[PDB]
Amino acid sequence: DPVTVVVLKATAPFKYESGKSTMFHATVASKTQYFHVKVFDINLKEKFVRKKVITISDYSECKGVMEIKEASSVSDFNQNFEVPNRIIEIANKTPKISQLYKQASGTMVYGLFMLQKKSVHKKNTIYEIQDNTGSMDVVGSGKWHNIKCEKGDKLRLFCLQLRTVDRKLKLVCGSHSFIKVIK
DNA sequence: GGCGCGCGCGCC
DNA sequence: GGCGCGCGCGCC
């Protein structure tokens, strides 16, 4: 059903494969929840700006993440719209590596984590991330082999998937994964 | 090329 | 939710 939200975050459009297309990620908030959104129509980028209020209908979902394909289904909302501020806070919280270690393979993961160790191999790059509860490997290939970063930088992860790899839960990149290196 | 407008977002 | 530095990018 149609849902009206306020945009909290939205990345710049980026290239990806399976067919090779374009997309960006966004995070939005109703008055009762926050959601991650994959937008596959890059002509909607102007509707997904910080603080813009939009109404989303005729979309699809997948593991709690919204998918938007046709611009025909986003409309501006210019009446008054206020979301409770904890929804904003939750929407911006990065989960703990100790909780990530307790979810099922398949779970999609988004957050900001600091990069403690970078190991580059032939086709894969293992980015070790840490917080005050644990460490975890991020596996990046293709677009995310050997990206520019060093110890102390932080990584913003968008739509990474928890997978068991050599008997341990890791984050691995797929077609829609995005990683941004900060500072 | 490369100015300069004005956002993004980590930090506050 | 505000701030402002760093930057992305339309324009010439």
Swiss-Prot record:
The gene is MNDA. Induction: Strongly induced by alpha interferon which selectively affects expression in late stage cells in the monocytic but not the granulocytic lineage. Induced in vitro by dimethylsulfoxide and 1,25 dihydroxyvitamin D3. The lineage of its organism: Eukaryota, Metazoa, Chordata, Craniata, Vertebrata. It comes from the Eukaryota. Expressed constitutively in cells of the myeloid lineage. Found in promyelocyte stage cells as well as in all other stage cells including peripheral blood monocytes and granulocytes. Also appears in myeloblast cells in some cases of acute myeloid Leukemia. Residues 1-182 form the HIN-200 domain. This is Myeloid cell nuclear differentiation antigen. It comes from Homo sapiens. Participates in a ternary complex with YY1 and the YY1 target DNA element. Binds nucleolin and nucleophosmin/NPM/B23. Its N-terminal half (200 amino acids) is sufficient for maximum enhancement of YY1 DNA binding and a portion of this sequence is responsible for binding YY1. May act as a transcriptional activator/repressor in the myeloid lineage. Plays a role in the granulocyte/monocyte cell-specific response to interferon. Stimulates the DNA binding of the transcriptional repressor protein YY1. Disulfide bonds: none annotated. It is found in: Nucleus; Cytoplasm.
